[PDB]
Amino acid sequence: SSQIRQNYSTEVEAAVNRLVNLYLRASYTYLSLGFYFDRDDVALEGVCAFFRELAEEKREGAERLLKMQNQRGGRALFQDLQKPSQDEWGTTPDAMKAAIVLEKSLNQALLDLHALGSAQADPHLCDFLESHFLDEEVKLIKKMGDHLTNIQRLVGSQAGLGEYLFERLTLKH
Amino acid sequence: SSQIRQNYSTEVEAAVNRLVNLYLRASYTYLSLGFYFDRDDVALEGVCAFFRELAEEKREGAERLLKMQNQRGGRALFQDLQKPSQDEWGTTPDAMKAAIVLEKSLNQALLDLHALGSAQADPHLCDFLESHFLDEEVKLIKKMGDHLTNIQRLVGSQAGLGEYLFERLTLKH
Amino acid sequence: SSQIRQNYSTEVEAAVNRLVNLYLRASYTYLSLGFYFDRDDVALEGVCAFFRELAEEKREGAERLLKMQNQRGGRALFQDLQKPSQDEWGTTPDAMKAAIVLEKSLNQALLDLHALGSAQADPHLCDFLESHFLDEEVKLIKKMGDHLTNIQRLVGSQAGLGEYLFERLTLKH
Amino acid sequence: SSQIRQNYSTEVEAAVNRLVNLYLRASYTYLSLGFYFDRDDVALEGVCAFFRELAEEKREGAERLLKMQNQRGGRALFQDLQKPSQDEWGTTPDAMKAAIVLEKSLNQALLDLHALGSAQADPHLCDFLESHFLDEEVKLIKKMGDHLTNIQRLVGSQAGLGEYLFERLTLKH
Ligand SMILES: [Ru+3]
Ligand SMILES: [Ru+3]
Ligand SMILES: [Ru+3]
Ligand SMILES: [Ru+3]
Numbered sequence: 139s140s141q142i143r144q145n146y147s148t149e150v151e152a153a154v155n156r157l158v159n160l161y162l163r164a165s166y167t168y169l170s171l172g173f174y175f176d177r178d179d180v181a182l183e184g185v186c187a188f189f190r191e192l193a194e195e196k197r198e199g200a201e202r203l204l205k206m207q208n209q210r211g212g213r214a215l216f217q218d219l220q221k222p223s224q225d226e227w228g229t230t231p232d233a234m235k236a237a238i239v240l241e242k243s244l245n246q247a248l249l250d251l252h253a254l255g256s257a258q259a260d261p262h263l264c265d266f267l268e269s270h271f272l273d274e275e276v277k278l279i280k281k282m283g284d285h286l287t288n289i290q291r292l293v294g295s296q297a298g299l300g301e302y303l304f305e306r307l308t309l310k311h
Numbered sequence: 312s313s314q315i316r317q318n319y320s321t322e323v324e325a326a327v328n329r330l331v332n333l334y335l336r337a338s339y340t341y342l343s344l345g346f347y348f349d350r351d352d353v354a355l356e357g358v359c360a361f362f363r364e365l366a367e368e369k370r371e372g373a374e375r376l377l378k379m380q381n382q383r384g385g386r387a388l389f390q391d392l393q394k395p396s397q398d399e400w401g402t403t404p405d406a407m408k409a410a411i412v413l414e415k416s417l418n419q420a421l422l423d424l425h426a427l428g429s430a431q432a433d434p435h436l437c438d439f440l441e442s443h444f445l446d447e448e449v450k451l452i453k454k455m456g457d458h459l460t461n462i463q464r465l466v467g468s469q470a471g472l473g474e475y476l477f478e479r480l481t482l483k484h
Numbered sequence: 485s486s487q488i489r490q491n492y493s494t495e496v497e498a499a500v501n502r503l504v505n506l507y508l509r510a511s512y513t514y515l516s517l518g519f520y521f522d523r524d525d526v527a528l529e530g531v532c533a534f535f536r537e538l539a540e541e542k543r544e545g546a547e548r549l550l551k552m553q554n555q556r557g558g559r560a561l562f563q564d565l566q567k568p569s570q571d572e573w574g575t576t577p578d579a580m581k582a583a584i585v586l587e588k589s590l591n592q593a594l595l596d597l598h599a600l601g602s603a604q605a606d607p608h609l610c611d612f613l614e615s616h617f618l619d620e621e622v623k624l625i626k627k628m629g630d631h632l633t634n635i636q637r638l639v640g641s642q643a644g645l646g647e648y649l650f651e652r653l654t655l656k657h
Numbered sequence: 658s659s660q661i662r663q664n665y666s667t668e669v670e671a672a673v674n675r676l677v678n679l680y681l682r683a684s685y686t687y688l689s690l691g692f693y694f695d696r697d698d699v700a701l702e703g704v705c706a707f708f709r710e711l712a713e714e715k716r717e718g719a720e721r722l723l724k725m726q727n728q729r730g731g732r733a734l735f736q737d738l739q740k741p742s743q744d745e746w747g748t749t750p751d752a753m754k755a756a757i758v759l760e761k762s763l764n765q766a767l768l769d770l771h772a773l774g775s776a777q778a779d780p781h782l783c784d785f786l787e788s789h790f791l792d793e794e795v796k797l798i799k800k801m802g803d804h805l806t807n808i809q810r811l812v813g814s815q816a817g818l819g820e821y822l823f824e825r826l827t828l829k830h
Contacts, residue, residue: 142456178802264440298810304825307639456524464644488802611787
């Protein structure tokens with residue numbers, strides 16, 4: 139039961155629970171990405187740290203969604219968290235491409251939810267997504283696109299050297 | 312007269328003046344609530360302080376609306392402020408229920424005004440309501456709902472003891 | 485591939501991956517427990533904080549296991565994370581009982597893994613489990629047992645009052 | 658003579674003296690490795706510093722074993738220290754491979770000694786090896802494996818450039 143729920147559709151409630159699952163899944167993917175780059179036969183510390191930090195950001199995103207759900211009088215419902223789509227993540231560019239795909243899928247889910255809340259006449263929801271989700275995704279996708287362009291510039295000729303240098307001089311900051 | 316007014320309907324201007332009256336009325340209600348809990352035969356200091364602080368918040372809300380009205384080139388028009396709906400406010404749960412009803416009525420008035428500004432194609436207005444009104448109401452209603460649940464848990468068996476304890480251990484922080 | 489793996493069986497490697505899944509599942513359970521106690525109709529902040537802190541501890545446990553796996557030249561393999569066993573968690577004593585059951589299951593999994601590593605003649609593994617897992621579980625289970633005894637003492641007669649008081653005077657520290 | 662010796666076999670005493678010789682030999686190997694990379698025609702300062710620091714760590718390991726030997730009432734017996742297996746150590750990857758082989762041989766000697774102390778029912782000994790030897794070796798071997806993977810990534814195409822860059826950007830920290 140709730141004594142506080144007001145202007146909060148069952149449709150938005152359900153969509154928020156689904157977005158929580160997507161963010162938690164994305165966090166799980168980044169955890170796998172991080173530990174893959176910590177393998178002794180991969181060994182790219184700056185790449186591991188980049189992905190581990192994203193694991194934390196996505197988890198924090200899911201927690202903010204859960205807090206919002208309760209603030210509105212909605213009810214958190216958790217689902218199975220699917221394992222990540224790969225066990226091994228290839229080279230730096232492969233991993234950075236997987237990350238951009240992942241983030242674009244989150245951004246699109248946010249866009250779909252804002253497009254649901256506006257159809258539900260729910261300004262609080264739109265305000266909330268705008269505030270700590272929409273701009274964050276845009277900034278993060280730009281950074282990943284910048285990274286990918288640099289990796290690709292580096293890995294054209296001498297792939298090993300380029301991967302090392304990107305990790306040392308871009309990611310180890 | 313105004314040399315600055317732009318994209319600001321007479322409809323929104325009037326609605327803002329009405330919202331000012333509602334916030335000022337809510338402030339007056341909380342002032343009465345606060346002094347009721349200061350009566351020697353009621354004597355719940357943490358409950359008095361809770362309501363007095365809300366009197367101040369609602370007044371500050373009305374003042375921000377008035378400042379916004381002038382920023383847009385609208386004109387403040389003040390009306391009679393109706394006395395609060397009760398002279399005596401019962402027990403803590405009674406008062407906390409009255410507060411939630413009050414805040415839900417403010418939130419609904421904000422929702423109605425955002426739903427007017429969007430119909431008026433007035434993004435500044437929506438931005439303004441989102442920024443210091445919509446989220447504030449949501450957070451405040453959640454806190455009141457949390458309080459009410461705790462009071463109700465406490466007041467089930469031994470009502471006097473429960474009221475004392477809630478005031479001492481939740482409100483006296 | 486690995487250039488470092490030494491005295492590390494495929495059996496222990498697999499068992500470590502399973503223990504990672506169990507710790508991550510336990511973290512997920514505590515996340516659900518934490519947000520349940522944040523519901524406006526439950527509203528026990530100290531209980532929410534207790535479970536949220538355990539969510540973090542179990543996640544950190546899984547990450548230390550993953551780091552260890554890589555230090556030994558083993559390979560992390562992630563599985564689906566099952567959703568928690570309940571959607572709603574009842575009263576404080578119900579939740580604290582579920583937590584003890586959960587922690588006992590983790591402890592037993594650790595005992596089983598130490599009993600595998602000794603059968604594998606793997607001292608590093610035993611040392612590692614002893615160091616940041618076995619004693620931690622014992623201390624945590626004792627604290628939960630202490631909590632449960634206090635809740636049960638409190639909730640015998642007047643259940644609402646007892647739950648409130650335990651949250652205010654034990655958990656809100 | 659000793660007035661303190663208790664539960665300390667002549668077998669463990671002898672094994673500890675042999676482990677002292679192995680650690681001192683490993684220290685001697687690293688001293689040679691360090692000074693080789695200080696040659697004007699080799700000149701890789703970060704590689705020299707890496708090996709010189711390992712010379713010190715292995716010596717400190719032998720001294721802790723000697724202190725332990727006396728704490729138990731055993732008697733230190735020193736043997737000839739064989740000169741290192743090479744006079745010249747090749748390139749960075751060659752040297753890092755020699756180091757991993759060396760450390761794996763130490764780790765295996767520790768494992769053999771823990772497997773002797775357990776057969777001797779000597780918990781103090783196991784505790785001691787676990788505490789400042791087993792985990793240290795594991796961490797060190799992981800770091801060397803990480804280094805080797807990076808060197809190998811670097812030295813694939815342009816070996817001189819890769820060796821320089823690894824020394825400047827990984828080892829010169
Ligand atoms: Ru919007
Ligand atoms: Ru709007
Ligand atoms: Ru053991
Ligand atoms: Ru042992």
